[PDB]
Amino acid sequence: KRGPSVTDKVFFDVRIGDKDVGRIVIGLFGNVVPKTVENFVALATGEKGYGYKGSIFHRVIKDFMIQGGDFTARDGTGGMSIYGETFPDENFKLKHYGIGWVSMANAGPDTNGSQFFITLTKPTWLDGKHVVFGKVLDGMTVVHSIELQATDGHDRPLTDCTIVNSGKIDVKTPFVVEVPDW
C-alpha cells in the first residue's frame, strides 16, 4: 500500500575466498533518489569502464553493517562516482529503517563516491547523515555469511569477500516497499 517504489535492481555474485556463496539482489528507489541510484547502477554494470566487479567488502562489523565499494584503493580511502570524485547528498527522504537497507558511506556532507553499506541493525544514529537508496530483496543469507567472517584489527575480513560479478535486472513494473510513515 504505502511506501517507496523499487524501480531498478542490481545483483552482486559473491565469493568468499574461492567458494561462491551466492547472489545479493538490491532493489533501488529510483524515484526518490534518482542521481544516487543512477550512480550505483552504472557502477554495478561497469558501463563507464570501471565499477564494483572484483571489489571486496573491506569493513565488516558484526550486528552493525558490511561496507564495500572501494574499487580504487580497496582499503576504504577511495572509490569514485560517475559524477566525479564526490557528489552532493541528494536528499535524506529515506531513513535506515531496519536490517538490509543500503546506504552511502561518506566522509562528511556531500562526499558520496562509490562506497556503500548494507545495515545489519536499525542504525537510527545515521539517519540524516547518509543517503539511503536501496534495500536487499534477496540474498540476506549471503550478507550474514560475510558478517560471520573473522576480521583483522581494522575490521577487514581475513579472507576476501569478493563481488565476482555484478549487474542490473530491469523491473517491468515498480512495486512498493511498505515503510512506516511515507
Binding site: 569493513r59 558511506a105 562528511g108 544514529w125 545515521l126 581494522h154
Partner: peptide
C-alpha cells in the same frame, strides 16, 4: 563507536 566513514574511521 559505530560510524560508516571513508578515510578517517572513528570510534
Amino acid at each position: 563507536x559505530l560510524l560508516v566513514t571513508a578515510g578517517l574511521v572513528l570510534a
